[PDB]
Ligand binder design. Structure first.
Ligand SMILES: Cc1cn([C@H]2C[C@H](O)[C@@H](CO)O2)c(=O)[nH]c1=O
Ligand SMILES: Cc1cn([C@H]2C[C@H](O)[C@@H](CO)O2)c(=O)[nH]c1=O
Lengths: 304, 300
C-alpha cells in the first residue's frame, strides 16, 4: 500500500518557517500554507490586526481583561478553523504508521491555534486559563505519524527578525514574542516529559535527553487560582482537560530545527530531519490524489 | 468486556428534560450549572441572554454580540467536550448493559445547536458556527440522542416554569432553537436515507428536502464566493457535519405528558438504543466515577 509523510512546521512567528518550507517543497510533495485569506477575509475581517490591537488596547488600559478575552477567544477560534477542518477531513485517510508516495508539508498544526497561541495569550492576560483548557479539550485526536518540527532561534536574533517578518495588522510586541517562545519551549518539553514516562498527576505536587521537570512543561501554566478548588486541588474538569492534553501530545513525533542559519541552510537542515520521520499508509489507494487535491485546494483558496 | 448504554437527552430548553431524566447500574451526568455560573466564567447563562437583549435593543452591534456569544458557547460546551474526550478511549464497538449513562445534553448542543440558533438570532457569525462544527468530536459507537416533541404553546408554558438563573424568556430564541433541533432531526434522517448535500445543494438555489435540513442555514452570504459558490473551507465543514451526524441514533420523546409518563416513555425508547462494549475490564467503574464526579462538582 502507498505511504504518506506528514510534517507540520510550527513554532513562534518570525523565525522564517514559511520560507524554508516553501524552499523545501521547491525540491509528490505538497505545501499547506497558513490560511491568511481565511484570517483576513473569509472567516472574519483582519483577524491578525484584531488580535494585536486588542492586546494593545488592553495593555493601554483602554479595554478590560474581560473584553480582551471575549475578543481573543473569538479571534482564536477563527484562526484555528482551517486547521481543524483540514485535520477532520484528512483523518479518515490516515492509515497506520509504516520513499513516501506523497509528502504534505504543513504550515502549523492545529495545536498552534488551539493550544499555543491561546496559552501565550493567557500569559499575556488576554485570555482566561479556563478558555485555554476549553480549546485543549477540543484538540482533535492525534493522528498516527504526526511529525512536528518546532523552531529554535536565539531571542536577540528573533527580535531583529521579528521587526522584519511582521504581518498586516501585526504589532511588534516583545512581551508576546517571549510568551509564545516560552509556550513552544514548554511544548517541546511536555512531549519529551510524556514520552519519558512522566505523569502530570503523579508530579503535580512538584510545582532527546532526560525527562524534564513538570515545572518545565505546559502543565505548569495551569497552576492558576481560577482552576483551584477551595481545597487547593485542580477542579476535576480542569484535571480532565490536562489528561486530554497529555493524551494528544504523547503520540506526536517532535523535531527541532535550527533557524539561526540561511534560508537554504534551514531547508537542507529540514530536508535532513525529514528522514527520521514516521510515514503512514493511506486508507484507500485513491486517498493520495484526494489528499493531494485537498492540500492544493486549501492552498489555492486560503494561501496568501 | 461488559457493555454500556450511553443516552444523551437533548433538545430545546424548557421542555422538562432535566426533570424527567432525574425521575429515572445507571448514572446521570447532570447539566454543568456550576461550571457555567462559577467554574469557567461567572454567570454564563446570564451573559448570553443579556447580550442578545442589548443586541435586540440596539445597545450593541451584531459584531459585539457575536464575539460575546462565541466566547460564551466555548464556556457552555467545555464540560461536554472534556467528558467526551475522557470517555472516548473506553468506548468499544457496538453490540442487559453493565452501565447506563444518562447525559443531560450531547456536545453538539453547544458546538452546533445553540450556535446555529444564535446565528438565526443574528448574534453569531455562520463562520463561527462552522468553526464549532469543525471541532465536533468523532461520533463514538452507540451514541443515542433523545430529542423532544412538544407543541409550541405548551413549550412556552413549560419554558416559563423553569428558566435558569440569568435567563430571559425569549420567544424568538425558543423559536430559533426549536427550529434548529427540528432541522437536526431532519438532517439525520436525510443523511441516513443516503442524502448528499453536495449533490442536493442546487435545490436550495424517501427523504427530507435539503431545504428542511441543517444545510439550508449555511446558504449564508458570508460563506459564499462572489459567484455564489460556497468556499471549500465551509464545504469541508459541511462534510464533517454530515459525517458526525449520520452515525447518530436519534430517538424522539413526546414531552406533552406527565413527568412519570415522560419518564416511562424514555425508559421505553431504551430497547432500540445501541449499546457498545467498553475497552477494558475497569472501564465501567472508571466511567462510573467520572459520571459521579462530574455530577458532584458541576451539578449545582
Ligand atoms: C496560528 C496563529 C497565528 N497568530 C499570529 C502570529 C503571527 O502574528 C501571525 C501569523 O502566524 O498571527 C496568532 O495570533 N494566533 C494563531 O493562532
Ligand atoms: C447547552 C446550552 C444551553 N444554553 C441555554 C439554554 C437554557 O437557557 C440553559 C439550560 O439549557 O442554557 C445556551 O445558551 N447554550 C448552550 O450551549
Amino acid at each position: 500500500m502507498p505511504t504518506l509523510l506528514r510534517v507540520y512546521i510550527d513554532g513562534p512567528h518570525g523565525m522564517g518557517k514559511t520560507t524554508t518550507t516553501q524552499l523545501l517543497v521547491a525540491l509528490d510533495i505538497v505545501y499547506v500554507p497558513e490560511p491568511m485569506t481565511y484570517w483576513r477575509v473569509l472567516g472574519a475581517s483582519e483577524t491578525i490586526a484584531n488580535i494585536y490591537t486588542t492586546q494593545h488596547r488592553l495593555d493601554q488600559g483602554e479595554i478590560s481583561a474581560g473584553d480582551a478575552a471575549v475578543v481573543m477567544t473569538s479571534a482564536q477560534i477563527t484562526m484555528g478553523m482551517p486547521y481543524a477542518v483540514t485535520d477532520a477531513v484528512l483523518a479518515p485517510h490516515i492509515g497506520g504508521e509504516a520513499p513516501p508516495a506523497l509528502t504534505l508539508i504543513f504550515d502549523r498544526h492545529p495545536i498552534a491555534a488551539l493550544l499555543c497561541y491561546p496559552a501565550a495569550r493567557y500569559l499575556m492576560g488576554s485570555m482566561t486559563p479556563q478558555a485555554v483548557l476549553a480549546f485543549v479539550a477540543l484538540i482533535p485526536p492525534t493522528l498516527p505519524g504526526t511529525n512536528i518540527v518546532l523552531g529554535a532561534l536565539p531571542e536577540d536574533r528573533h527580535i531583529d527578525r521579528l521587526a522584519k517578518r511582521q504581518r498586516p495588522g501585526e504589532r511588534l510586541d516583545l512581551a508576546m514574542l517571549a510568551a509564545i517562545r516560552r509556550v513552544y519551549g514548554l511544548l517541546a518539553n511536555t512531549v519529551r516529559y510524556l514520552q519519558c514516562g512522566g505523569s502530570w498527576r503523579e508530579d503535580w505536587g512538584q510545582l532527546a535527553g532526560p525527562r524534564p521537570h513538570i515545572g518545565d512543561t505546559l502543565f505548569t501554566l495551569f497552576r492558576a487560582p481560577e482552576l483551584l478548588a477551595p481545597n487547593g486541588d485542580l477542579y476535576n474538569v480542569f484535571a480532565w482537560a490536562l489528561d486530554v492534553l497529555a493524551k494528544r501530545l504523547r503520540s506526536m513525533h517532535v523535531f527541532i530545527l535550527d533557524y539561526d542559519q540561511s534560508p537554504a541552510g534551514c531547508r537542507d537542515a529540514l530536508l535532513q530531519l525529514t528522514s527520521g520521520m514516521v510515514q503512514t499508509h493511506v486508507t484507500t489507494p485513491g486517498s493520495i490524489p484526494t489528499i493531494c487535491d485537498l492540500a492544493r485546494t486549501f492552498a489555492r483558496e486560503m494561501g496568501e
